[PDB]
Amino acid sequence: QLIAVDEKLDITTLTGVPEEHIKTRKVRIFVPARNNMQSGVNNTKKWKMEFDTRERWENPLMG
Amino acid sequence: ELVQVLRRGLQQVSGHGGLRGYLRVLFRANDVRVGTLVGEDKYGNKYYEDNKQFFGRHRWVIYTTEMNGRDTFWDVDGSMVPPEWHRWLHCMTDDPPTTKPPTARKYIWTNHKFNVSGTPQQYVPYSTTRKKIQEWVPPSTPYK
Amino acid sequence: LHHALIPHGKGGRSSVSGIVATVFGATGFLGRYVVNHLGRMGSQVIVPYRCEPYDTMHLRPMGDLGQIIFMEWNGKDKDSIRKVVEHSNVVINLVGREWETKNFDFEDVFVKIPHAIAQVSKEAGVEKLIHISHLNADIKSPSRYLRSKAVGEKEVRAAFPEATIIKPSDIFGREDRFLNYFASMRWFGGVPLISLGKETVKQPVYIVDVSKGIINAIKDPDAKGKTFAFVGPNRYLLFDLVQYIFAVAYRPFLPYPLPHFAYRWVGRLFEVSPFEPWTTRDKVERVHMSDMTLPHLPGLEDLGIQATPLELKAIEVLRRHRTYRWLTSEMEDVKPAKTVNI
Amino acid sequence: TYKFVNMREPSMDMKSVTDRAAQTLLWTELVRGLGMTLSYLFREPATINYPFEKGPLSPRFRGEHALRRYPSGEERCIACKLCEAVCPAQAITIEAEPRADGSRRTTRYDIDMTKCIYCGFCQEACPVDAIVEGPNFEFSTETHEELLYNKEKLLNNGDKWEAEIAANIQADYLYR
Amino acid sequence: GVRTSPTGEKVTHTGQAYDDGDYRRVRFSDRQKEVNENFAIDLIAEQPVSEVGSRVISCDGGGGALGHPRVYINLDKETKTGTCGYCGLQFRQPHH
Amino acid sequence: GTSVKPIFSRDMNEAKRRVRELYRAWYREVPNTVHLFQLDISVKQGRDKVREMFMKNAHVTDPRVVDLLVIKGKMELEETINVWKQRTHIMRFFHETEAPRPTDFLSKFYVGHDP
Amino acid sequence: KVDDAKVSPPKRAEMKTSMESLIHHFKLYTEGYQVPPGATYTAIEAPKGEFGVY
Amino acid sequence: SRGEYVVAKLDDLVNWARRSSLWPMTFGLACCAVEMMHMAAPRYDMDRFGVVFRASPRQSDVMIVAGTLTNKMAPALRKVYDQMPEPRYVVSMGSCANGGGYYHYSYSVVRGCDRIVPVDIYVPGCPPTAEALLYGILQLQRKIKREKRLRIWYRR
Amino acid sequence: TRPTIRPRNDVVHKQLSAFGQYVAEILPKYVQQVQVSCFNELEIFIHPDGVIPVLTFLRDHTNAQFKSLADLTAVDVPTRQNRFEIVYNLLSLRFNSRIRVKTYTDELTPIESSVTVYKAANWYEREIWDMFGVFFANHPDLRRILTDYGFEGHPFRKDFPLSGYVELRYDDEVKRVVAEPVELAQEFRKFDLNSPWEAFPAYRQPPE
Ligand SMILES: CCCCCCCCCCCCCCCCC[C@@H](O)O[C@H](CO[C@H](O)CCCCCCCCCCCCCCC)COP(=O)(O)OCC[N+](C)(C)C
Ligand SMILES: CCCCCCCC/C=C\CCCCCCCC(=O)O[C@H](COC(=O)CCCCCCC/C=C/CCCCCCCC)COP(=O)(O)OCCN
Ligand SMILES: NC(=O)C1=CN([C@@H]2O[C@H](COP(=O)(O)OP(=O)(O)OC[C@H]3O[C@@H](n4cnc5c(N)ncnc54)[C@H](OP(=O)(O)O)[C@@H]3O)[C@@H](O)[C@H]2O)C=CC1
Ligand SMILES: CCCCCCCCCCC1=C(C)C(=O)C(OC)=C(OC)C1=O
Ligand code: SF4
Ligand code: SF4
Ligand code: SF4
Ligand SMILES: [Zn+2]
C-alpha cells in the first residue's frame, strides 16, 4: 500500500552539499559542440551537465 | 681449529696497518674484515671485495674523512658514493669502473655532491615560467 | 600593489592574502596565535628565531607549503634584522621577557631591540609596523618593565612615525603567565596577596582577541599611526579574580596578606634561579597595580572585535589544574565573579 | 585432489602411551624447540653492514627521476607531454613554447615527488628517453618543499647521474 | 651560458628571474637558487653542420634504438640548413 | 496516486511525531555530551545548536525526506552516545576556525568574484 | 604480451621506426584502449581467499 | 670561556645519548609499514643501531608515519603524537604520508601528515626501500647530533 | 581468430541460457529479464519487490544451491529515473556456477534487507548506504562503515566531487583537528580523452 505524496521531488537536504554550492551555482545542460579540429561526431551524442567556472589563481610556490 | 681463528683475528689486526688502523676501522665502520682493494675515489673512498662472503657482504666501501666541504670522520652517509662506484657497489654490474670506465660527457658533473638537505646549499623550489598577464603602464606626464 | 601581492582565493590555507609579514618574537605565547592567524588566510610569514629549531616546530603546520620561512636573527645585530625584513610589507614586534637575564635587561629587549627593528624597517621600505606595548606603560612606574616599555614606544614612534602601537592588558590564555601563575601558586599552601588584593583592579584580555586585533590592524587602513588599548570587557578586584580562578580550578582558596617588603624579598629570593624564574620583583610589582583606564584610546571594538569575557574562556585554561575528581565539571558551574564595572 | 592436515590417530599400545607420558612429564618437544633456537644461535647472521655495504639492485630499479641529454648536450625532452598524460598520480606539470631558435622545448617541467608513486610509467611513455627513474634512492629531505622538483633540479639530477643511467639503459634496453 | 640579473640573481635557461620588488626572493635568503648551468641552446649551437651528398637525409639521434624516432629531412633549400625536430642537429648539401 | 512506497510514515503527522521523539532524545543527550566530551561550551549552547540543526531542514514537506532525515539524526545521536565521535567531530558543528564570510553585496565585491 | 598493438604497446624499437607503432604508442599512453561496453565479475583464489573485481 | 666549553660538552653528551637510543612507536598504516618490517628484519637489523620498537607512546621517541593518513585516522594520530613525551621526532615515510601520493585528490585523505603534526624527515618512495628508511633514520640521527639546546640556554 | 582472441565456450553458454529460462519460468512474478553475456555470465533483472523471494529461491532450491554471496554492490546512473542499480553476485559450489541478480531503486525508495537470506550481506548493505545513500529496511544495524564520523553526503554518487567539500587540518588555537572548505594548491586537471570516432560498431545506438 502506497502513500501518494503530491509534491515535486527535492533531495537537497539529503546530499550533504553546502548551501553555497546549491543556490549560487549555475549548471549548463548542453550537447557539446564538435571539436573543429576533427571530423568525428561521436562526442556530440549525449547531453552534458557542467557547472559555472569559478576563480583559479597562481600558487605562490611552484606557480 | 681455535688457534686458526685466533691467528686469523691477529691477521685482521695486523692487516689494517697496525693497532691504530685496526681501532680506526673498528670505530669508523664497526667492522674489521680485510678484503682485496678494488679501487679508490677521487674523493678518497676505498672499495674492497671478498668473494668468499655471502651476497651483500662481498663488496664494501671505506668512506673518506673529508668530502667537498664537511668532515666525514664520523658523519658519513651513502650519498657520498659517486655514480660509477654506486653502480658497482649495489651489484647492478659485476665490473668496477676501473676496468669499465663510464662514457665521458661534457655535461656530466666532474665533482659529485652528497645530500645537501639541512645546509645552505639545499634545493629551494621556484616557478620557472615568465609572467603571464602584462599590466598597462600609465604615462609619466600630467594630462592637463 | 605589485601584482604578486594582490589577494587571491577564498581566504583559506591555499589562498593569497597579499601580506608578507616578519613576526619578531613569534616563538612565544602571543607569537604562535599571531602566526596561526596569519597562516590561516594564506599569508607569507617570516619567523626570525634565536632559540633551538626544535622550539619552532609547532609553528610548521600553521601554513601551506613555502608560506612559513624560518631564519636566524640576533637582537644586537642589525644585519640580521635587515636580512629578515628585506621583502616584508608588514613587520610585527612581539619580543619581550618578563625577567632579566645576564645578556638582556629590560632596556635591551624593550628599548634597544624595538628601536633597531623600527629603524631597519623604515630604511628597508617596510610599509606597516605593529609594535606591542603595555596598557600600564609609564615613564614614572615602579616597574622597570613598564618604564622600559614607555621609553621603547617613544623611540619606536620616533623611528617609525607611521607605526601602530597596541597596548594590551594581562593577556590570558592556555600558555599565559596570568591564570597559570595564580593557579600554580597553590603549591605553597596559602595565597599571598598584598593588601589581600583588595586595592588592585584587573582588566584581562583574551589571547585570540589580541591576535585578531593585530590582524585587523594590519588589514585596516585607518589604523596606521594610531595607538590602541586592548582590554577585556570586565574589571575585577584582584582578590575576587584570584578567588574565581581557584574556584574554577576547584582548589581550596587560602588567601593571606603579605607586607609589600616581604613579598619583594620573596621575589628577589626567586630571582636567583639561572632558569626561568618562578616569580620576580617586577612580577610582584606588576601583579599588584590597578590597570590604567585610557578612554581616549581606540579599543578592540574599533577593530570590529567584541572582547571575550574571562568567564567564557577560563575553563579552557584552568581545567588542566584540576584533580581527577573535578575534570568533567561544566563551565556554567562556578558562579561568575563580581565585577567593579564603573 | 586433496589431503588431510589433522586426521591422524595415535596408537594405544603401552609403548606409545609410555612415550607420550614421558613427553608430557619431561618436556621433550620443548627441548627440541630450544635445540632449534640454539642451532640458529651458532649460524652466521644475515645482517649487512649498512651504509658500508648495500643490498643488491637491478638495472630496472626505479629510483629518483632525471632528465637526460643527447651527447651534444641538447635536451632530449621535446615537450610532447606523454609522461604528463600517462602519470597515474598527476605528479608531472609541463609548460612549453618555441625556443629562441624555434625548437620545441619545455619552459616548466615539475614533478611532485610527494605525489609520485614511482611506477615508471613516465619513462615507458617517453619516446626519446628524456625522463628516467634513476638508480638513486637516498634523497631524503628535511622540509616538504625540497621534494617539489622543477626543471633545473631534474636536469641537475640527469647531469649528475648520467654515467650510471646510460649504463643501466645499455644493460636493459633490449628488454623494452 | 648563465647570466646574472641586475640584482645578482642568476637567470635560468628559461629566462626566469624575480623582479627587484618581488617578495618571493625571500625564499632564497640563507639558501641558494637552483640553476642548471649547461644551457642546451648554446650546446646545440656549438654543433657543426653535417655535409651530406643527398637531397634527403635520415636522423635518429644516434645510438639506434637509444635515440629518437627516425625522421627524414629535406635539403632542397640552399638558403638554410636542415634541422632535426628532435635533436637539433643540422645538415646541408655541399655548395660554394 | 504517484505510486510511492513509504519508508516509515504514512503521512506528515507521523513524520512530525518522529521528529519530536528525535528532538527529545537529543535534548536529553546534550548535557551528557557536554560532561563526557569535556566541552568548553555550555549546555544552553549545545541545545541551541541542536535547535538550529533541526530548524535548518524546517522547510521539508515530503514525508520520506523527513523520515530519512530522522534516520540520519538517529545515526548521529547513536554515534555521540557511544563516544564513537571525538571532541573534534562534536565541535565541527560550531565552525570556530572559519572566518565569518560577509553577506552584503559590497564586501563580496571587495574580496573577489564569487556571488 | 599479446601481439595486438591496439591493446599492448609495441616494442620501443618498433615505436622509433614504424609509423603505426608510433601512433599506437602515442594513443595507448595518452587515451588508452577502449573496452567494449559490458560488466564482468572476475574472481581468483588469492592467498587470502576469493579476490574479485566487478 | 669555561662555561661555554662545559655546556658544549654536555650538549654533546645529551645529543649522543638521544640519537644513539631512538625508540619509534609501534605505528604503521599501510604498505609502507611492511617495508618498516623489512627494516627490522635480519638483513638490515635496525636494533643493531639501537632502534627498538615500543608499543606505548609514553615510552617512544620517534613517530614513523608509514602509510596513508585518512580523515578518520587524523585525530588518533594527533592524539598518540601528543601523548609522546618530549623530546620527540616525526619521520614521514612514503608518498601518502609526505603529500598524499596516489590518493592526493581523494575526499577522505589528508594531503600530507605535516598538516597534522610537524615533520623532521621526509623519506620519498612508494614505498621507500628498507635501505631508504634506514638512510632517513641516520639522517635524523645527524640532525639530532646538530642540536645545541644547552648552548642556546647559556647564551640567553 | 586464433592466438590473440579469447576462445568461446558454447556449452556453458547453452547451460546458462537454459538455467535462466528455468529461473524465469519458476518466478514470473518478479523476473523482468534474463541475459547471458559473451563470456558466459548469467544475469537476471528483477523487480525490487522480489529481492527476498528470488534470492531465497536461489539459495535454497535443490537445483540452484547458490549458497555463497560473493559480492553485493550498487551502480549509480544519474540519467535513469531509478538512480541506483543493486547488484548481487552469487556462487554455487554444488554446481560450480555463478549468477548475478540486478534490481533498481531511487533515492527515497528503500530496498529490503537480505541479511535473513545471507548474513554476509550485513556489512555489504551498510557499505551501500554509506557510499550511495540507499536505505535498507529491517537492517539489524545500519550505519556508516567506511566514512568519517559525521561525514555528510554519499561519496560514490556520480555528482559527488572527487575531493569532496571539506578537508582536515590541526589548529593550534583550538588545539584540535578541524574541518574547513577544500582549497587545493594544485587543482585536479580534467582530461578529455574520448575519441570522436566510434570504436565498436556492434554497440551502435539508433540515431533517434
Ligand atoms: C658518573 C654518574 C653520573 C653521570 C652518568 C654518565 C656516565 C658517563 C657517560 C659516558 C659517555 C660516553 C659517550 C661517548 C661515545 C661517543 C663515541 C663517538 O662515536 O662519538 C663521536 C663524537 O663524540 C660526540 O660528539 C661526543 C660524545 C661524548 C660527549 C663529551 C663527553 C662528556 C662527559 C661529561 C660527563 C659528566 C656527567 C655528569 C656529571 C654530574 C660521534 O660519532 P657517531 O656519529 O655517533 O658514530 C657514527 C656511526 N658510524 C661510525 C657507524 C658511521
Ligand atoms: C622410587 C621413588 C622415587 C620418587 C618418585 C620420583 C619420580 C618422579 C617422576 C615424575 C617427575 C615429573 C617432573 C615434572 C613436573 C611437571 C611436569 C608436567 O607434567 O607438567 C606439564 C607441563 O609442563 C610444561 O609444559 C612447562 C611449560 C613451560 C615451559 C618453560 C620452559 C621449559 C623448560 C626448559 C628447561 C627446564 C630446565 C629445568 C631445570 C633448571 C635448573 C634448575 C604438563 O602439562 P600439559 O602437557 O599441558 O598436560 C596437563 C594435562 N595432563
Ligand atoms: N603576556 C601578556 O600578558 C601581555 C604581553 N605583553 C607584551 O606582549 C609581547 C609578546 O607577549 P608574549 O607572547 O606573552 O611574550 P613571550 O615571553 O611569551 O615571548 C617572548 C618572545 O620574545 C623573544 N625574545 C625574548 N627575548 C629575546 C631576545 N633577547 N632576543 C631575541 N628574541 C627574544 C622570545 O624568543 P625565545 O623563544 O628564543 O626566547 C620569544 O619569541 C611582549 O613584548 C610582552 O611584553 C603586553 C601586555 C601583557
Ligand atoms: C618486531 C617485529 C617488527 C614489527 C613491526 C611493527 C610495525 C607496526 C605497524 C603496524 C602493522 C602491523 C603490526 C601489521 O601487521 C600490518 O599488516 C597487516 C600492517 O599493515 C602494513 C601494520 O601497519
Ligand atoms: S613514476 Fe609514475 S607517478 Fe611518478 S612521475 Fe612517473 S608516471 Fe608519474
Ligand atoms: S619527458 Fe619525454 S614524454 Fe615527457 S614531455 Fe619530455 S619528451 Fe615528452
Ligand atoms: S606511499 Fe605507496 S607504499 Fe606507502 S602507503 Fe602510500 S601507496 Fe602504500
Ligand atoms: Zn635527430
What DSSP element (H or E) covers D109?
strand D104-112
DSSP string, B31-95: -----EEEEE-SSS-EEEE-TTSPTTSSEEEEPPSB-SSSB-SS---GGGS-HHHHHHHTTS-SS
- Cβ of H139 within 8 Å of Cβ of B78? The answer is no
Cα angle at I166 between I160 and I167, to 5 degrees?
125
Distance CA C147, CA D91 (A): 57
Backbone interruptions in chain G following residues (C to N > 2.5 Å): none
Tell me, in Å, the resolution of the deposited structure.
Answer: 2.7
Q: Which long-range contacts (CB under 8 A, 24 or more apart) does C284-288 make?
A: C284/C194, C285/C142, C285/C143, C286/C136, C286/C143, C286/C145, C286/C146, C287/C181, C287/C200, C287/C238, C288/C194, C288/C195, C288/C197, C288/C200, C288/C238, C288/C260
Q: Determine which residue's CA is closest to atom 2 belonging to ligand 7.
A: H126
Lookup: cell for I122: 550485513
Cβ–Cβ under 8 Å, residues C215 and C228: no
- Cα dihedral C78, C82, C83, C88 sign: positive
Neighbour count for residue C41 (Cβ, 10 Å): 21
Instruction: Confirm if H88 and I163 have CB atoms less than 8 A apart.
Output: no
Q: Which residues does D contribute to its contact with C (CB < 8 Å)?
A: 144-145, 148
Check if the beta carbon of residue I66 is closer than 8 Å to that of residue I90.
yes
Closest CA to C89 of C179, C162, C150, C156: C162
- With an 8 Å CB cutoff and a minimum of 3 pairs, decide whether chains F and A touch: yes
Candidate CATH numbers 1.20.1250.30, 2.160.10.10, 3.40.50.2000, 3.40.50.12280; the one for domain H2-155: 3.40.50.12280
Residue D21 in contact with ligand 2 by CB distance below 6 A: no
Phi, psi of C258, deg, nearest 5: -125, 135
Taking residue H39's Cβ as centre, other Cβ atoms within 10 Å add up to: 24
Angle at I48 between CA I43 and CA I49, to 5 degrees: 120
Neighbours of H19 (CB within 10 A): 22
Q: Chain C neighbours among B 109-128 (CB < 8 Å)?
A: 125
* Helix orientation angle between B19-29 and B2-14, rounded to the nearest 10 degrees: 90
Find where cell 594610531 sits.
C226
**Is E61 within 8 Å of chain D by CB?**
yes
Instruction: List CB contacts (< 8 A) between H117 and chain C.
Output: 61
- Count of residues making up chain A: 63
Residue D175 marked ligand-binding: no
Residues 6+ away with beta carbon under 8 Å from G34: I195, I199, I200
Cα F37 from Cα F85, distance rounded (Å) = 9
Separation of first and last alpha carbons in chain F: 41
Nearest-CA residue of chain D relative to G1?
A: D176
Nearest to I179 by CA among H80, F45, F76, H74: H74
Total CB pairs under 8 A between chain B and D: 132
Question: In chain H, where are the structural domains located?
Answer: 2-155
List residues of C whose CB lies inside 8 A of any A CB.
4, 8-10, 14-16, 44, 64-67
Cα–ligand 2 centroid distance for C294 (angstroms): 88
**D24 ligand 2 Cβ < 6 A:** yes
Residue D71 grid cell: 651527447
Burial track I156-173 (b if 16+ CB lie within 10 A, e otherwise): bbeebeebbbbbbbbbbb
Can you tell me the distance from the alpha carbon of D133 to that of D60, in angstroms, rounded to the nearest whole number? 9
Q: Which residues of E touch C91 (CB under 8 A)?
A: none
- Distances from the Cα of D61 to the Cα of C72, D168, D169, D175, angstroms: 40, 9, 11, 14
Q: In degrees, to the nearest 5, what angle opens at C-alpha D28 toward C-alphas D24 and D33?
A: 125
- The string of DSSP letters for F8-32 reads S-SSHHHHHHHHHHHHHHHHHHHHH
The protein residue whose alpha carbon is closest to atom 2 in ligand 5 is D119
Q: Does the beta carbon of I93 lie under 8 angstroms from any beta carbon of chain G?
A: no
Mutant choice from C33, C38, C331, C334 vs F, greatest count of F C-beta within 10 A: C331
DSSP chain I: -GGGSPPP-HHHHHHHHHHHHHHHHH-TTTEEEEEE-TTS-EEEEE-GGGHHHHHHHHHH-TTT---EEEEEEEEE-TTSSS-EEEEEEEEETTTTEEEEEEEEE-SSS-EE--TTT-TTHHHHHHHHHHHT---EET-SS---SSSPTT--S-TTSTTS-TT-SEEEEEETTTTEEEEEE---SS---------SS-S-GGGPPP--
- H118 and C54 within 8 Å at the Cβ level: the answer is no
The length of chain B is: 144
Beta bridge partners of I105: I84
Q: What is the spatial distance between Cα I123 and Cα I121, in angstroms, rounded to a whole number?
A: 6
D168, G3 Cβ separation under 8 angstroms: no
Contact E61 D78 (CB under 8 A): no
In 3D space, the residue among I119, I83, I116, I89 whose CA is nearest the CA of residue I101 turns out to be: I89
Per the CB < 8 A criterion, the answer to whether A2 and F3 are in contact is yes
Q: Please name the helix (run of DSSP H) or strand (run of DSSP E) that holds residue C206, with its range, or none.
A: strand C205-206
Residue of E31, E33, E36 to mutate for B, most B C-beta atoms under 10 A: E31
Longest dimension (CA), chain F: 52
- Domain range for D89 is 64-175
- Dist. CA C101–CA C262, nearest whole Å: 23
Alpha-carbon distances of D147 from B126, C63, C282, D140, H145, rounded to whole Å: 12, 17, 49, 8, 23
DSSP string, H38-104: HHHSTTT-GGGGTB--BS-GGG--EEEEESPPBTTTHHHHHHHHHTSPSS-EEEEEHHHHHH-GGGT
Residues E40 and E56: beta-carbon distance below 8 Å: no
Angle at C122 between CA C118 and CA C124, to 5 degrees: 115
Cβ atoms of D161 and D134 closer than 8 Å: yes
Rounded to 5 degrees, φ, ψ at E71 are -130, 160
Q: Is I51 exposed, middle or buried (0-12, 13-18, 19+ CB in 10 A)?
A: buried
Ramachandran sector of residue I92 (left: φ over 0; alpha: ψ -120 to 50; beta: rest): beta
Backbone φ and ψ for I200, nearest 5 degrees, come out as -125, 100
Q: What CATH number is given for E40-92 in this structure?
A: 2.60.260.40
CA gap D134, D140 in Å, rounded: 15
Instruction: Using the structure block, give the residue that is written with the C-alpha cell 648554446.
Output: E42
Q: First-to-last CA distance in chain A?
A: 61
In E, minimum Cα distance to B128 occurs at: E16
Contacts of H139 in chain D (CB under 8 A): 140, 142
DSSP-assigned letter for residue H123: E
The residue among B68, B67, B108, B90 whose CA lies nearest residue D160 is B108
Method of determination is: cryo-EM
**Contact list, D121 vs chain G (CB under 8 Å):** 29
H70 close to ligand 4 (CB < 6 Angstrom)? no
Q: Give yes or no for A4 touching I (CB within 8 A).
A: no
Q: Is H119 on the interface with C (CB under 8 A)?
A: yes
CA C143 to chain centre: 17
Cα three-residue angle C63-C65-C70, rounded to 5 degrees? 70
